[PDB]
Ligand binder design. Structure first.
Ligand code: AKG
Ligand code: MN
Ligand code: MN
Length: 190
């Protein structure tokens, strides 16, 4: 339902490395995050785009000070996705416009440890993972609003990830129309 792959072996190999938990958040939790983050994101302009930037059509913030309700959600993510690992001192909040997208990349190994965990809000999208040496090994993850994904180990180090732009936004054969998306990303310390 939420993962498709280039073949059975990549699917088995990454089954606990690339994880989607649809409906990890309740509607109330989605609302908590939106009410806290929408106003903060509105204070910033969508950034200038660059050809050699991974992220296109976006604004963002780092946030370490959170309401108690949002902190309860972040602690649920930490329990679900991270061992005992330490998290970075801030959480990355990313606002992609409907025309925005993310190009294939591997998160910096200088600043991010073994695990990335992301909450998706507002609208559905498709995350594609592609092996960095072998373009024939890939996964597609369907990220609906309220979902948590986890990329760890090989899914974090050996595969790029990207968020498909509207015209390319397909989960298998199915078109996933893109809208404005907010994501809330927790990362481990290296
Ligand atoms: O929006 C997401 O879920 C991922 C963002 C991302 O890949 C990044 O900021 O490195
Ligand atoms: Mn920025
Ligand atoms: Mn990334």
């Amino acid at each position: 339902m939420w993962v498709r792959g280039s073949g059975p072996s990549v699917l088995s190999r990454l089954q606990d490395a690339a994880v989607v938990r649809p409906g990890f958040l309740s509607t109330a939790e989605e609302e908590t995050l939106s009410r806290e983050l929408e106003p903060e994101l509105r204070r910033r302009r969508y950034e200038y785009d660059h050809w050699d930037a991974a992220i296109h059509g976006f604004r963002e913030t780092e946030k370490s000070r959170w309401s108690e309700a949002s902190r309860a959600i972040l602690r649920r993510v930490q329990a679900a996705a991270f061992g005992p690992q330490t998290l970075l001192s801030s959480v990355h909040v990313l606002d992609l416009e409907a025309r925005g997208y993310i190009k294939p990349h591997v998160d910096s190994i200088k600043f991010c440890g073994a695990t990335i965990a992301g909450l998706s809000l507002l609208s559905p999208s498709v995350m594609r993972l592609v092996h960095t040496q072998e373009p024939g090994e890939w996964l597609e993850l369907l990220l609906e609003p309220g979902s948590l994904y986890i990329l760890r180990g090989s899914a974090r180090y050996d595969f790029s990830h990207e968020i498909l732009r509207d015209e390319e936004s397909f989960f298998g054969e199915r078109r996933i129309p893109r809208g404005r998306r907010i994501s809330v990303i927790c990362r481990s310390l290296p």
